[model samples]
Target: KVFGRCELAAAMKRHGLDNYRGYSLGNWVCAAKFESNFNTQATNRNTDGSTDYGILQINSRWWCNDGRTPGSRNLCNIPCSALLSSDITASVNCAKKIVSDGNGMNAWVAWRNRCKGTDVQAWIRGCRL
Candidate 1:
């Protein structure tokens, strides 16, 4: 149901993110691993009783409050899961434009370093490329 590995790579390539340093899908994967152990359907309740959902560990309310996952708001324009199901180039571009505010790969790297435990030194080197 979701585009994984080579499919994801193809999508990113279509979106002009083929260069790992330009948009570190590798690091994004690392971040996902760090976030929810790569669980797509996992949910958690905050101490305040808020809900978080999805594989990317996106919180509906925090990211887009259209649905339990990012299926509304941001996802409504383009189904959240479609980011995985359809052309990922669209998704990665969307992620870069909206999520990173046009900062491009650096923003992705930042998210990876902050959310995941990617080594700062490695990030620095990769970012330079």
Candidate 2:
């Protein structure tokens, strides 16, 4: 499912991405914009043979387990398929774990490329949190 900008903002906030680990809601939304374009079913296969899954594009090698991925840590202890669901709970939680693991939002290059240093509120303007 594709989320409208405000809709994704509300959902991420509801799941506690707002300022989680010092990253703001705007960073999350902007990263999602580039990572998956708000598509819950997004999937990208990396050259390393691992796949990125879902809205935040959780990776199979380090985060979630997909039998196809070699040397998967399964740090999030979730199936990569879970991240692909319409409900973002698993994806959100997994993302939190990613940050808590000390990777921070920069764990995603999308955030590094598109969201870093930009006005956070710009992503949420006209939508009340």
Candidate 3:
């Protein structure tokens, strides 16, 4: 599933500009990329005993509506996971604002911290576009 530099570059395009790290943009994008390669279908363990899914790796139980599991409307319906659906428009926009607010990359920075910079992780951390 790991692609070339362009794939990583494409991912960064959705998250940050070549110099977009000031307002925590770099860190936040790093987190989302780390979580699921910006994949909407990504799922992982959560600190609250639930599952974090989607592009931003939002917790399904917290972000999704209704009772839809990862396979249902509940999955992508939530605004948080829009990027996770492979549609980076919304997630990218939202993250730009969120990171610009100086929230310390918010959830993204926290998540990215969990993993050191591997090749893929390196791209997510500090790859040039």
Could you say which candidate leads in lDDT? 2
Which digits, one per residue and each the tens of the lDDT, describe model 2 over residues 1-129? 999999999999999899999888888999999999999999999999999999999999999999998777899999999999988999999999987876688899988878888886788889778
- lDDT, each prediction: 0.44, 0.92, 0.51
**Candidate 3 residues 9-128, lDDT tens each?**
566565564346553334444565666775556767655455665565655554454344444334334444454555555555554444455553554644547533423335444455
Ranking by TM-score: 2, 3, 1
TM-score each candidate. Answer: 0.45, 0.96, 0.51
Q: What's the true lDDT of residue 53 in model 1?
A: 43
The better-scoring model by lDDT among 2 and 3 is 2
Give me the displacement of residue 36 in model 2, in angstroms: 0.3
Q: Can you write out model 1's per-residue Cα lDDT over 1-129, one digit (the tens) per residue?
A: 343444434444456654444545555544444444544545565454345444344434334343443322453254444433333343444454445554433433335556444552342233322
Which candidate wins on TM-score?
2
Q: Can you give the lDDT of residue 35 in candidate 1?
A: 46
* Worst window of 10 by summed lDDT in candidate 3: 115-124
Pairs clashing within candidate 3: 40-84, 40-85, 55-84
Which ranges in model 1 have alpha carbons more than 4 Å from their true place? 1-21, 66-94, 102-129
Candidate 2 residue pairs in clash (backbone atoms < 3 Å): none
